[PDB]
Symmetry: C2
Subunit: 343 residues, 2 copies
């Protein structure tokens, strides 16, 4: 979200200065910039970031300037496409937690910021909560408000999603009049590819293209090699099931994590799938195979003790069934399946 311009925003913050920050909070009609996109105006008048495809930057720039002066935050609607921009003043006084959020982001700790952008009681506006998996700071001004937003915020966060939530003026689910924006900062989600066959390269590009960090992993050191996968974030040599087990235990995999089994060697894929099919959920567990391979794996897996409920979590054969033949088409059919299964 503010990731692009955060360095600039921090420098203002640390230096005791006050920045005008505008955040796209809602988009309609395919407005150029997604929800969360930011624009920051430094004390000296410099602006980094973008909120629109230039279409309303001038307006927002002025709005940000005025906001710093009055110190009153403002939700503004512009309207190709309709944009909702929240403009707020940001400084050590107005936002004490910003330094720590900056550190969370660097340290890869998920964190979310929930800001009231609409409320019948003008004083509520601009109040915010900083949410972690395990803790929460600040107050909206009501336990019931704080309680609901915290829960919803953690959910979005776990999913890495940014969104506007609506409530009654005191936090009632389903009522109306209070809206809050939740801006989630989760680290890049990861894709784990087990089996360093040539085809992994193709899988890894689709992963990169979708914004996953791809780890490629294989027990055979000839296969699992930086040289053969120069674009993968990381190449590892291990027993796939030992690697996966360890990431689980270290909390290095979360619910957006995606796993591809590109091996049908019984020495590997069965221990692997025993670990993977039993993990409190993660987004996707796919296994590459023709229809023959897929039926023989399922058999082996049943014989290994997997239950139908566990087996259900498995996407096999891998990919949507688009009819593709070349490996590139299989790779796209996989990417398509990943997207589909999360929406």
């Amino acid at each position: 979200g503010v990731r692009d311009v955060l360095g600039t925003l921090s420098a203002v913050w640390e230096s005791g200065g006050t920045a005008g920050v505008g955040t796209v909070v809602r988009t309609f009609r395919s407005a150029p910039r997604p929800a969360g996109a930011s624009m920051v105006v430094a004390p000296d008048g410099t602006v980094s970031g973008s909120v629109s495809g230039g279409c309303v930057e001038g307006a927002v720039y002025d709005l940000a300037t005025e906001v710093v002066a009055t110190g009153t935050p403002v939700l503004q609607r512009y309207g190709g496409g309709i944009l909702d921009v929240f403009v707020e003043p940001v400084s050590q006084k107005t936002f004490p937690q910003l330094g720590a959020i900056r550190d969370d982001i660097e340290a890869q700790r998920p964190v979310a910021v929930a800001t009231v952008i609409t409320h019948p009681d003008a004083q509520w506006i601009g109040r915010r909560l900083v949410v972690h998996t395990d803790e929460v700071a600040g107050s909206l001004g009501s336990s019931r408000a704080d309680a609901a937003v915290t829960d919803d915020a953690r959910g979005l966060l776990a999913a890495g999603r940014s969104e506007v939530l609506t409530y009654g003026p005191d936090g009632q689910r389903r009522g109306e009049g209070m809206e809050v924006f939740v801006s989630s900062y989760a680290p890049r989600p990861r894709m784990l590819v087990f089996g360093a066959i040539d085809f992994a390269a193709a899988v890894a590009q689709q992963g990169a293209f979708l914004g996953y960090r791809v780890t490629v992993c294989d027990a055979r050191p000839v296969f699992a090699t930086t040289a053969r996968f120069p674009t993968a974030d990381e190449v590892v040599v291990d027993w796939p099931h030992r690697y996966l087990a360890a990431q689980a235990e270290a909390g290095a995999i979360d619910a957006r994590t995606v796993v591809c089994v590109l091996t049908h060697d019984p020495k590997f894929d069965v221990p692997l799938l025993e670990v993977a099919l039993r993990l409190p959920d993660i987004a996707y567990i796919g296994a590459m195979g023709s229809r023959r391979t897929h039926e023989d794996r399922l058999a082996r897996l049943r014989e290994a003790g997997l239950t139908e409920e566990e087996l259900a979590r498995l996407s096999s054969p891998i990919g949507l069934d688009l009819g593709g033949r070349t490996p590139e088409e299989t790779a796209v059919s996989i990417a398509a399946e990943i997207i589909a299964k999360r929406w």
Copy 2:
């Protein structure tokens, strides 16, 4: 197919020498190399190309050596995965048309080679036909044989596909005992992207990834710029409908051609879709749009005179419906739709 190693193969051919060429003709069980993959052994014993993931190169190498000596072509089956390899001797005497095929390939003229790989009458084997859209050279040894194979070959060729076809011993559709391999050399198919908005970049990478030549095209010279699309094969400034009309007229678009309309500006997309929806078929005509945009385009198009039959050829909104939101996910959903609609 032989494209990788053709330079080497030609040099042998031109120099009066005889090469042993092995061609993967059929694969089973996800054998490493697709149908058409070649391996050529030069007179001096050098080998370029690959037929398997090293698994049977030694065997094939020897087979190719023996074949050159006896001058008798041989279909051989190996069997991870099962491979069918046709090994034949290639020289100016045994293959007079090879130079011209080499030139066709360079000049971008589609051409196909149909070779008998199985027949009850041993003399038939290795006989071949060279097929163009508009002509055919050589003989199988029977008008009925020649007639059937030519037709089927043109079809595959137009689709850029390589495959084994089966016949009765005299060309009877559906009989058995004679099989021929058709090895198609079509130029890269093309993807035409109309509308140089930022999102075109994402569309263009999926296109590249699938092996299309992507042309990006837009009337506005600020948008349609090498700088903004450095990976696109070609960037053009034109009225989309004038460009498309001209390619049709020059025979620069064929039935594997794919078209993406990324604009909903009425000044462009309507003339464009009038040209595109009326072209003797091409593979795909997609139009980007939300559901609102899509309904308004359809209306405009009806008002412009398009028929329901013509309108049917349109994929709108563009992409498979996977639920994606970011532009990368939309782009994959498009690629997925392209693959699906051709199989």
